[PDB]
RNA sequence: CGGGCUUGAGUUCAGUGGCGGCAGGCGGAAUUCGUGGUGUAGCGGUGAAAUGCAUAGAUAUCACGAGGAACUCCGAUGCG
C-alpha cells in the first residue's frame, strides 16, 4: 500500500565502500531502492562512476512507471558516484528539482574510532 | 643605634583587557537505543576476504520517544 502521486524525493547514502540510491514519495516511504552491492559490483570497484550509474538506471527505471515524474536530490556522505548517479536520474525520464547536500556534519559529537596503522 | 628623602616596594583612584577560577541555568548539530510507517536482497568491512548483522523482515527512509557525551565555523591569538 504505497501512493506516490507526481513527485518525489530521491536519497543517495554514498561512503568510501558502497553507495544506495532509494526514491520515495514525499512521505519518505520508500517506492525503489538499487546499490553497487545489489548490482554485483562486490569488489573494491563498488565505489565507481559506472556502478553507481548502472545502480541509478535500475532505480530510476523501476520507479518511473508508478507516477514518479519530478524528484528532489539528497546526498548524504563522500564517494565518487553520486554526480554519475544524479546525471543517470536526471536523464532517466526523472526531472530533478534541486540538489541538496544532506551530508552530516558533526559540531564536535562524539569520538571517532582511532586510527589504522 | 637615632633621624631624613622618594627613585625600589606596597596601598588608593582612574582606564582598559582576558578559553583566569568556582557555582547555577539554557542550547543546536552529530551518535546510540526503543516504537510505528514504506520497502526487499543485501548491508558492513578489507590489499583481498572472512567473522558479524539480515525473509521470525536488515541496510536505506520518515515520524514519535528516551538517554549519555563533546562543543564545527570564529580559531592563530590570549590568560594562568
Same mark, same amino acid.
Given at each position: 500500500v504505497v501512493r506516490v502521486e507526481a513527485v518525489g524525493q530521491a536519497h543517495i547514502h554514498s561512503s568510501?565502500?558502497?553507495?544506495?540510491?532509494?526514491?520515495? #514519495?514525499?512521505?519518505?516511504?520508500? $517506492?525503489?531502492?538499487?546499490?553497487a552491492g545489489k548490482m554485483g559490483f562486490r569488489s573494491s570497484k563498488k565505489n565507481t562512476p559506472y556502478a553507481a550509474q548502472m545502480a541509478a538506471q535500475?532505480?530510476?527505471?523501476?520507479?518511473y512507471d508508478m507516477g514518479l515524474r519530478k524528484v528532489t536530490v539528497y546526498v548524504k556522505g563522500?564517494? #565518487?558516484?553520486?554526480?554519475?548517479? $544524479?546525471?543517470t536520474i536526471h536523464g532517466a525520464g526523472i526531472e530533478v528539482m534541486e540538489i541538496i547536500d544532506v551530508?552530516?556534519?558533526?559540531?564536535?559529537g562524539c569520538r571517532p574510532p582511532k586510527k589504522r596503522r
Open positions: 568510501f565502500n558502497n553507495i544506495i540510491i532509494s526514491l520515495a #514519495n514525499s512521505e519518505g516511504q520508500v $517506492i525503489s531502492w538499487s546499490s535500475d532505480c530510476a527505471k523501476v520507479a563522500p564517494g #565518487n558516484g553520486r554526480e554519475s548517479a $544524479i546525471r551530508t552530516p556534519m558533526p559540531h564536535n
